Amino acid sequence: PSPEILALRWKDTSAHYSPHEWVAARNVVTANKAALADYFYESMLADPNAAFFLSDQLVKTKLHASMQDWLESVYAAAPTEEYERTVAFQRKVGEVHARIDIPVHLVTRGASALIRRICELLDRDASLSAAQAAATCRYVADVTMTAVEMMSH
Amino acid sequence: PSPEILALRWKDTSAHYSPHEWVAARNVVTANKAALADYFYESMLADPNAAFFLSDQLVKTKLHASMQDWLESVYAAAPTEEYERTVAFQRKVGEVHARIDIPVHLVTRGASALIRRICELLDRDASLSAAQAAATCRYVADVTMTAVEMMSH
Ligand code: HEM
Ligand code: HEM
Ligand code: HEM
Known part of the structure; x- marks a missing residue:
């Protein structure tokens, strides 16, 4: 659909959470982006x-950079x-994955592992209350699922 | 698509997790299904x-029962x-939601809140290790996102 419609989708999803959630997620994700990208590749x-789509160290470096780029994209919006x-x-990203035939089930697998790992970082962050950690975790799951939907189209 | 293709999708997603994850998720969800359905409605x-789609106590009872039914469906597969x-x-469920024009963003909002709440129950379950809790949480997110995709089509 139109950029306008898709942008409105992201806005509608994001509007359910407060700017404190948006910023807490951006801070924790961006502070841990390399570790998150490292964890994704090991996953x-x-x-x-x-692993069927993995090869050498050169591609490992590209995958790590692109994951860091995606984490910044998602949390900046x-x-x-x-x-x-x-x-x-x-x-x-969806167009790039589809052209190389990455199955959606592996994308959702990766997204699930990112949601859990980000949520663990939030629960460990001393500067977030348990209320804040849970609300930001819900935001993380919501934009992650929203992104996966957009990629898949 | 064909039932066969969709069934294969659920199978491929589920196959990434062990039967211990499948059973731990089913046990915790089914033991807390009414509380989960109560929490969903309050959400x-x-x-x-x-709330724009909510009304009286009669509909509250129907929504509570259908949510319990969905939780059983998802975790039984x-x-x-x-x-x-x-x-x-x-x-x-997708056909029922679409006919009444429930926006996808609210479905994903609800799914995000379910993922967090189920994951909290898993982290609190004394009979699960932290390793098991995280693996089962990943499974929960993965089948939840997978279900949302199927509903949305
Ligand atoms: C949450 C899940 C995923 C996210 C957010 C993600 C993100 C990305 C991004 C940002 C790119 C760069 C796109 C561009 O060039 O503009 C990319 C490319 C790619 N992704 Fe993913 N991806 C995910 C899942 C996967 C999975 C599960 C696999 C493999 C099974 C995979 C393999 C690849 C490969 C092979 C490329 C191209 C790398 C190259 O340039 O050689 N991705 N992905
Ligand atoms: C590989 C194929 C496809 C995949 C994996 C896919 C995936 C998804 C997912 C994951 C969602 C919502 C889940 C979320 O928000 O996290 C969704 C919603 C939706 N899908 Fe698809 N889809 C595919 C193909 C299609 C096609 C071919 C159509 C229509 C011609 C379509 C129409 C829709 C519509 C209309 C929605 C809800 C509208 C919206 O919220 O933007 N999908 N899809
Ligand atoms: C994870 C998210 C959701 C799940 C799993 C879910 C599940 C279900 C299920 C199982 C049914 C029964 C379908 C049938 O008759 O066979 C249903 C119907 C319905 N759902 Fe949802 N739903 C979700 C989100 C929502 C949201 C966000 C809303 C409102 C904003 C909503 C409002 C309704 C309504 C009004 C009905 C029809 C109730 C009636 O019979 O009067 N649902 N849903």
């Missing part, structure tokens, strides 16, 4: 269906009101 | 966009190999 390697930019990024 | 009521039955249930 892929440990799964034969995903709501607090910067750059909905249209994030939405185009998701459609581009 | 809807507290959100003006969702993998451990009983009843992929086709769960997959038909998701398409039916």
